[PDB]
From a paper:
ATAs transfer an amino group of a chiral amine compound to a ketone compound using the cofactor pyridoxal 5’-phosphate (PLP) with a high turnover rate, stable catalytic activity, broad substrate specificity and excellent stereoselectivity, which is achieved by a proposed large-binding pocket (L pocket) and small-binding pocket (S pocket) in the substrate-binding site8910111213141516. Each protomer (subunit) of the dimeric enzymes shows a structural architecture typical of the fold-type IV class of PLP-dependent enzymes, which are made up of two domains. The substrate-binding site is surrounded by the cavity among the two domains, the cofactor PLP, and the loop consisting of the residues 129–145 of the other protomer. The substrate-binding site can be divided into two parts as described initially, the L pocket and the S pocket, which is consistent with the previously proposed mechanism for the substrate specificity of ATAs in which the smaller and larger atomic groups of substrates are recognized by the S and L pockets, respectively.
KNK168 (FERM-BP-5228) (Ab-R-ATA) by enrichment screening, showed activity on primary amine and methyl ketones or small cyclic ketones. In this study, we used Ab-R-ATA instead of ATA-117, the parental enzyme of ATA-117-Rd11, and could elucidate a reasonable molecular mechanism underlying the engineering of ATA-117-Rd11 because the difference between Ab-R-ATA and ATA-117 is only the amino acid residue at position 306 (Val and Ile in Ab-R-ATA and ATA-117, respectively) far from the active site, which is supposed to have negligibly small effect on the substrate recognition and activity and is not conserved in R-ATAs. The models complexed with a glycerol molecule at the active site of Ab-R-ATA suggested that Arg138 of the wild-type Ab-R-ATA is important for the recognition of probable native substrates, such as pyruvate. The kcat/Km values for pyruvate of the R138A and the R138Q mutants, using (R)-1-phenylethylamine as the amino donor, were about 350-fold and 500-fold lower than that of the wild-type Ab-R-ATA, respectively, indicating that the side chain of Arg138 is important for the recognition of pyruvate. The importance of Arg138 in the pyruvate recognition was also supported by molecular dynamics (MD) simulations of the wild-type Ab-R-ATA complexed with PMP-pyruvate quinonoid intermediate. During the simulation, the carboxyl group of the quinonoid intermediate formed a stable salt bridge with guanidinium group of Arg138. Although the corresponding arginine residue is not conserved in Ab-R-ATA, the guanidinium group of Arg138 of Ab-R-ATA was located near the position where the guanidinium groups of those arginine residues in the other R-ATAs.
Numbering used by the authors:
A (entry chain A), B (entry chain A): 2 to 330
Write the structure that this text describes.
Amino acid sequence: AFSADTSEIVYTHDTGLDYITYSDYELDPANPLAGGAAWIEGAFVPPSEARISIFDQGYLHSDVTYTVFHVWNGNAFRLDDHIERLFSNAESMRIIPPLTQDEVKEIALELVAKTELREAFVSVSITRGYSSTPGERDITKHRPQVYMYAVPYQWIVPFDRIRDGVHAMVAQSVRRTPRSSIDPQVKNFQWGDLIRAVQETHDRGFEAPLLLDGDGLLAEGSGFNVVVIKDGVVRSPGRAALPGITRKTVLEIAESLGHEAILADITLAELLDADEVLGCTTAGGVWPFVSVDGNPISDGVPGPITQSIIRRYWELNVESSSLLTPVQY
Amino acid sequence: AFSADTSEIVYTHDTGLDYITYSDYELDPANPLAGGAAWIEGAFVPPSEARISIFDQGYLHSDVTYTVFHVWNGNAFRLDDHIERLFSNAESMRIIPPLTQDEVKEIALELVAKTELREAFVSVSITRGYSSTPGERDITKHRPQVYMYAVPYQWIVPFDRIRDGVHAMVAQSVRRTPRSSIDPQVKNFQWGDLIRAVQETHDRGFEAPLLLDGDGLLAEGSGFNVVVIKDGVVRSPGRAALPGITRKTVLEIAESLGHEAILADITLAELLDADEVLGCTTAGGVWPFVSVDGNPISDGVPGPITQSIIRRYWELNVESSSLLTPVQY
Ligand SMILES: *Cc1c(COP(=O)(O)O)cnc(C)c1O
Ligand SMILES: *Cc1c(COP(=O)(O)O)cnc(C)c1O
C-alpha cells in the first residue's frame, strides 16, 4: 500500500489563482518519511507502514474523535484552536486523552517537519483505544490512543471551481444525524449520513450536497460548513453543523470587512433567495456555491463578498501573527 | 499489545448452567495463532500483529459493514445466514466485496481452525478500503478490504444473569439513529448513539439500555435485540432494529413451541406491561430482562417461555443439521 517513491508523490500544483501559491522546494529522497508519514504508538512511520490495531474501538465502534489542521507555506493554521476543539470533543465523549494539548502539538509539528511538507493536511484522532485482551467488551477497560498522519494538502473542490463556483444540491434522501443520536458539534468519523448525501449527489448529477436537519433547516455539507449572505448579512447554521475553524475564520473576515456575521437558523427559502452562498472547510479553504438544485444563486457567478472572503482567507494563510505556527523543518 | 502467552488466554469457563458447556481441550503452545488470530490482507496473524491501514475508510469515515458469527463446540452457527446478511449490507452501502460469499466462508473457517478455538467470536468486516495514495478523497477510487478476527467467545451478559435476569433501562438521553441518517438494519460500527445509551445506563445505575426510535417506539439495545412476550404472543421491534440472526432463531423457537412470533411496533406501555422480556445477540445468546427502569416485569423473575427459548437456543448450538457448520481443525 502507498508504494510511490518520493519523486512520485504529488505535493505541489500550479493553482492558476494568484492568491494560492505552493512553496518552491524539493523533498529529500533519502528521507523515507518525506512527503507523508504517520505517528502511531510512539513511532514515526511511512504511510505504507501506518497501521492501527484492528481491535481499536476507534475502528470497531467508531469510538473516536478527531481534527484536521493544515499547514500552508510552512505554518500550521490555527493549531491552538484545533487542538482545543479536539480535546473538548474528546471530553464530550468521555475519552481522556493520554497526552496533553501541548504534547499533541509538539508531536504533530514534529511529524510535519519529518515529512518536509510545506503544505499539508494533518489528521489527529483520539480513540477509546483497546484493552489487555483483544475481545474485551467493557468500554471502561480500554486505554485510549492518539493517532496522527500528515500528507499533502487535500482539496475538496478543484481550483477552477474555487474561481467559477460549485453547483450544490439539497439532499432529500438523508437528514443530518440528529444531536439526540450523534452530536454533529463533535467532530467524528461516523459519516453514514454524509456519505449517503454524497451518493445522492452523484445519483442526481450535482457536485456537492447540502444537508438539512430534523427540523428541515440548513445543516452542513459532507465535511464542510455552508454560509449564506443576504443584503450584506453573513449567516451560517448554528445547530446541525460542526463549529468549523474555517467557518470561524470566515465570520471573523466578514466582520473585518464590515458585515454582520452570525450563526443562525437558515431556511431552505432563504438559501435559494440568497445573494451569495459559500462553503468552507480545512481541506480546501473557501469556495462559492453558484447554484442550488440547478437554480442559480443570484446571477449564477461568485459574489463580491465571497470573493473578498476567499482572497482574505488565503492572505491570512501567508501573513498572520496570531493564526500561524511555524513548523521547525 | 495483546502479549498474553497461550497459557494466559482464557478460552473456557465453568458456566454453572447445565445447557452451556465449553469444549474440553488444550491450545497448542507451539502454534502462535492458538487462542486468537486475524486475517488481514491475505495473512493470518496473531492479535499482537493484527493491524489495518490508518488510511482505510473503514476507520476514517466508518465506511464499513460487518457481521459477527460464533462457533460453539467446533461448529459455526448460521454461517450462511451471516455471510448473506453481510453481503446484503455491503450492497446497501454500494460496497462491492473483493471476495465471494464462498471465499469469505472458506477463509473465516480456516481462520477459526488456526486459532484452535472450539468456542469463538468471529468478526468479518468489509470496508470501502483505500486508494493508491494515502490522502485520496474521491470515495469512488478506494479499493475495498475484508478483515477478519477470531477470538474467544464473548459474553454480553454474565452467566448468573442469564439465569437470574438483567435489569434494563429505557434510554432517554438518546434515540436510536433514524434510518433517514444511518440505516439500523445495516450492521455498522457507527455506535455513537448506542455508546451514549451505555453511558446513560451507567449514569442511572442500571445494567443494560433499551433505546427508542424517533416515533418513541421500542428499538433495540447496545448490540442486541429485545423481545417482548404477552399472553403467549412473542413480538420484537421490526423497524429500528438490526435483523438479528439470534432474533431470527428466537422467533423460530417461539413458533416451534407453539407461540405466535412476529415483528411489530411495541409501545413503552406494552414493554412495561409485558409478561416476559428478553434480549438476544450473537455475543452471549439469549437472556431475561426482569425489570425496566426499576419496575419489575411481571413477578421480577425469568418467565417460562424465556427459559424455554434460552434452553432451546443452546440445544440448537449442539445439535442441529441445518444450523451448524463444522470447523476443520
Ligand atoms: C471538519 C468538518 C467541517 C469543517 O471544520 P473545519 O474546522 O473548518 O475543518 C464541517 N463539517 C463537518 C461534518 C466536518 O467533519
Ligand atoms: C449485531 C447486532 C444485533 C444482534 O444481531 P445478531 O445477528 O443476533 O448478532 C442487534 N443489534 C445491533 C445494533 C447489532 O449491531
